[PDB]
């Protein structure tokens, strides 16, 4: 087990945690991984691409490949859940850039994963603004270590 706050709570609320205020989230034993953010009909999901740090990041551990995602406008993100097939992943919150308003999340993903699904929302107009389905497609299949083209 790790000591990081698992997200079972609005991202708007977990950023308020002092334990991960501006915490170093470095991982030099990692790499860039480009990505696309999509709707159910294969189109782009425009808010999600616009408001997420490119490149995302694969960290290599002694077990299973971990994926970091910066998400911009952190205090305006509400629901943030990540799913592999129909199996919900536990999302760990690692840092909150208070100057930039950037939340850095991390989810362990299965060996060979090409793309991952995202149920999310935002805080606009004193209302929850929903996004049922947001597929996060990755530029290539995700693996253990650097043994991929």
């Amino acid at each position, epitope marked *: 087990n790790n*000591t990081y*706050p*698992i997200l079972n709570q609005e991202l708007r*609320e977990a950023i*308020k*945690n002092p*334990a991960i205020k501006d915490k170093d989230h470095s991982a030099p034993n990692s790499r860039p991984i480009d990505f696309e953010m999509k709707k159910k009909d294969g189109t782009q999901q425009f808010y999600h691409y616009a408001s997420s740090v490119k490149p995302a990041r694969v960290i290599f551990t002694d077990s299973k490949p971990e994926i970091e995602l910066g998400l911009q406008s952190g205090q305006f993100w509400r629901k943030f859940e990540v799913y592999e097939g129909d199996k919900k992943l536990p999302i760990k919150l690692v840092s909150y850039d208070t100057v930039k308003d950037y939340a850095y999340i991390r989810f362990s993903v299965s060996n060979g994963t090409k793309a991952v699904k995202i149920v999310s929302s935002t805080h606009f107009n004193n209302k929850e603004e929903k996004y049922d389905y947001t597929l996060m497609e990755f530029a290539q299949p995700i693996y253990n270590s650097a043994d991929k083209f």
Partner: antibody
Amino acid sequence: EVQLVESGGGVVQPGGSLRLSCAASGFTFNKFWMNWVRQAPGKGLEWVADIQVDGSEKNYVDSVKGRFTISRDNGKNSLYLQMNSLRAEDTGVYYCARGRYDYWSGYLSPWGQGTLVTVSS
Amino acid sequence: DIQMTQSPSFLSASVGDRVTITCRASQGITTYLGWYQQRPGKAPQLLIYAASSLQSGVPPRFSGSGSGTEFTLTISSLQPEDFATYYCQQLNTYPYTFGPGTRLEIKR
């Protein structure tokens, strides 16, 4: 109910030792930050120390560092403060107090009812 | 240390009145700040966290305001059980210091 019951307090003389205890029930102890806060007779609140979920990190106020050690035991559900080398400035009421949510530092609810420490020869 | 100072430190007030009390810090702290309540002879309790946010179980009359150095707690309609000492705490950087307090008493 979330419960926090402290023992260990009492009278001790300048130089001396005292170990404090805090039994915790009604939550998963291994998923929360634990903090100590103190309060000298008549005066107000002053943060002492905190300890991470598995005892990875610990932070102490400057006054207290070198002399007080903070600890855990997640299998017994209890929090310790080992106070050696004790002073006149240390006589006060010593609050056990838990992080307000899972893996949240700093903000404290609930707290315990209090255990008087007196330092007077 | 980041020093927390508080205005006023004693405040006269009746039951019904609309009370405000400030907390100020020697540095910039975003909205990383709590408000705590302690009655006489009793452990403290969390009222407000993240400068604005209301802890579960607290009544809707306690507000939280301010961002940066200057911070505000407001009880819009004062009650018999609200007479107590109120403490701010910064949670920006260690050590996580409290302020001297502000004491609320009954007016006569």
